[PDB]
């Protein structure tokens, strides 16, 4: 793919999210750099509207699979870069077990040399005293697999996976993700064999930052097809 060539170096990242969860409006900005050669993203996110009304961990998966490292033997399965620079639409529904759901729609595309991820999120049916609106989730790192499958009908991909969010009481809040991606442009894309993306994450705070924020260092690798 021609899009693959746009990711061989370090790429500036810009993220914008407008959210509404049970009527609580908020916005998030992010910035960083991606180095897909190494599957790496270095990111910092800020809540631009004050305090986030949901836990940072619940937004991590919403807040750029184009930065995954595909091993050479799997490069024909990288839909995400093949859709660049025109980009793709990424939609999810995230079902939180015994709580509400998030519906997200994002456009991921280049604006010049910057990879931009613009997101709208709507959350409904959340429990005002639950683990999400009650802020009862551990601020720790999310790591694991996103299962990718071709969606030939939509000239794109679907993904599915469950995030296990640690709760402050030792329990787990399951977040069941259903994902659809469709190219924005009408140029040809790569439709993959089944595989997954493996994410390793380190989450931190900026000790000099007074705004509500999250710092992430992410490594994402495609896998599941043998050498």
Author numbering: 2 to 64, 68 to 231
Q: What did the publication describing this PDB structure actually write?
A:
Recently, a fluorescent protein based on an anionic tryptophan (Trp) was developed and was named WasCFP. WasCFP was further improved to enhance its stability across a broad range of pH levels and temperatures, incorporating 13 additional mutations. This improved variant, which exhibits strong green fluorescence under physiological conditions, has been named NowGFP. Spectrally, NowGFP exhibits green fluorescence (λex/λem = 493/502 nm) at physiological and higher pH levels, contrasting with cyan fluorescence (λex/λem = 429/475 nm) under acidic conditions (pH < 6).
In the case of the monoclinic (C2) crystal form there are four molecules inside the unit cell, and one molecule is in the asymmetric unit (chain A). For simplicity, we refer to chain A of the NowGFP structure in the monoclinic form as Mono. In the monoclinic (C2) crystal form, the crystal contacts are categorized into three types, denoted as contacts I, II and III. Contact I is between molecules 1 and 4 (or 2 and 3), which has the largest contact area for Mono. Phe99, Tyr182, Gln157 and Lys156 from two molecules contact each other without any water molecule in between. Moreover, protein crystals are highly hydrated, with those with lower solvent content typically having better diffraction quality. However, solvent-content estimation reveals that the orthorhombic crystal has less solvent (∼50%) yet results in a lower resolution (1.7 Å) compared with the monoclinic crystal, which contains more solvent (∼58%) but diffracts to a higher resolution (1.45 Å). In the case of the Orth(A) and Mono structures, the key residue Lys61 has ∼80% k1 conformation and ∼20% k2 conformation under a high-pH condition (pH 9.0). This shifts to ∼50% k1 conformation and ∼50% k2 conformation as the pH decreases to 6.0, and finally to ∼20% k1 conformation and ∼80% k2 conformation under an acidic pH condition (pH 4.8). Even though the high-resolution structure of NowGFP shows a partial trans conformation of the chromophore at pH 4.8, this is difficult to observe in our moderate-resolution structure (1.45 Å).
